[PDB]
């Protein structure tokens, strides 16, 4: 009793945004690529090899958005031949795997750094930062290939308008065709989102349970109380935190009570950026990754007629917001990265 047809068009709302984002994006990652390379030194911060890589994939993406800005503008008309439609598409997914793979190497930096599972000679942090960055780019390009090979152009539906689209006609037969849509889709998001995002959640966890316990400096005599070491000479064993130390405890060095101590909140900015990145990363990339995952569950749990169409005319949006998640890391480094903000003022002056 049920039929399938689009929602009231958004006009040029998306292609507008697409250009806005190409505009801010090409100019915003343009910087964090100079700011990291304006520095020539071995004063490159650990988590900088990944911020560069983050900028490059966000960049190679947003440069193509003039292409996707017209195609969505002429209501799906691709006048750029099969090559670009292949290649341009191929770079949507390249960026998406890279952006994920960076944001966890960005995080696996802070786990290696801020928990140090092995001793510091064997921690090999630059290499683990740098071997990470190489095999990163090789995955995100390799596993992005079925979108290079299979995406073709073609006027579906008899309408005098070309469409760029995934064509399972090499790989599939007409009944198994939806299978390759589903498998190549649950691959993408799985490797693309659920594996990375839980990794970053896994990393983000172990960081807090060691970040958990707090050092404490004696405000009068200077002695610092680390909960790993403790003060076992005075009864209070290691691994204990400060508020549990019996309230009769006093400074081992001078003997003022707990009344005069001072928790150090060791100002880290590397970690605080890496989450604001991730928590907006996983806020823009969740929609597109929730719906594509419901709709390929939606052919294979048999969702009502209502739903499948819903999730189809929902999608061009979720694409478009997850697409902006590129031209935001440039803004986030501004509102939050010290090394970044400073490296800007500096060039400014000179001219």
């Amino acid at each position, epitope marked *: *009793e049920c039929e399938y047809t689009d929602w009231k068009s958004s006009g040029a709302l998306i292609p507008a945004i697409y250009m806005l984002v190409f505009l801010l994006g090409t100019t915003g990652n343009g910087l964090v690529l100079w700011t990291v390379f304006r520095s020539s030194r071995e004063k490159r911060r650990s988590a900088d090899i990944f911020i560069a890589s983050l900028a490059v994939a966000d960049l190679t993406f947003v440069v193509t958005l003039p292409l996707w800005a017209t195609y969505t503008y002429r209501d799906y008309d691709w006048p750029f031949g099969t090559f670009f439609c292949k290649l341009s598409s191929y770079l949507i997914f390249v960026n998406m795997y890279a952006s994920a793979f960076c944001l966890t190497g960005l995080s696996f930096d802070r786990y290696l750094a801020i928990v140090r599972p092995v001793a510091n000679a064997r921690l090999r942090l630059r290499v683990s930062g740098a071997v990470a960055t190489a095999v990163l780019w090789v995955l995100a390009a390799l596993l992005a290939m079925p979108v290079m090979v299979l995406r073709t152009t073609g006027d*579906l539906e008899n309408t005098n308008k070309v469409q760029c689209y995934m064509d399972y006609s090499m790989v599939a037969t007409v009944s198994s065709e939806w299978a390759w849509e589903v498998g190549l889709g649950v691959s993408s998001t799985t490797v693309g989102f659920v594996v990375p995002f839980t990794i970053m959640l896994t990393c983000y966890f172990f960081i807090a349970q060691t970040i958990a316990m707090k050092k404490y400096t004696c405000t009068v005599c200077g002695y610092i109380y680390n909960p790993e070491d403790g003060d076992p000479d005075n009864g209070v064993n290691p691994g204990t935190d400060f508020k549990d130390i019996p309230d009769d405890w006093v400074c081992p060095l001078c003997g003022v009570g707990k009344d005069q101590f001072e928790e150090v909140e060791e100002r880290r900015r590397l970690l605080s950026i890496i989450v604001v990145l991730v928590v907006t990363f996983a806020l823009c990339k969740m929609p597109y990754h929730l719906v594509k995952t419901l709709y390929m569950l939606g052919s294979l749990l048999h969702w009502p007629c209502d739903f499948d169409l819903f*999730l*189809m005319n929902i999608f061009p949006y979720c694409t478009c917001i997850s697409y902006v998640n590129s031209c935001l890391n440039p803004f986030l480094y501004a509102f939050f990265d010290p090394r970044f903000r400073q490296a800007c003022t500096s060039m400014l002056l000179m001219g």
Partner: nanobody
Amino acid sequence: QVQLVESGGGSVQSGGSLTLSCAASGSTYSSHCMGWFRQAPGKEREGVALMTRSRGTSYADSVKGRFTISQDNTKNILYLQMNSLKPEDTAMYYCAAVPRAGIESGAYCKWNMKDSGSWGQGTQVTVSS
């Protein structure tokens, strides 16, 4: 793994009310679209009433306003309600079906690509004077 069986069409006289089921199997609304053709014969094959991505249904200029078409994912069946029938609509009707595309394309029915998709025997309709 996909079958389509046309049932409903015999002989009716002008101005009649026919309705033609295309009971479908293996197909999914989610992955597949549905449409109707016909042959005279002595002529060619011609699209009648399809189920499109963009417009609700793309009728042909001749059958427009007379035929009504509907899907029913519940029992998975495509319909063709023919009202006020013309003898030039004397012909044998088949239902096809076609795969759509990853929503990255727009869930677009591949109507044109090849119409070497899921077909059926056709059912034949006869309109006399």
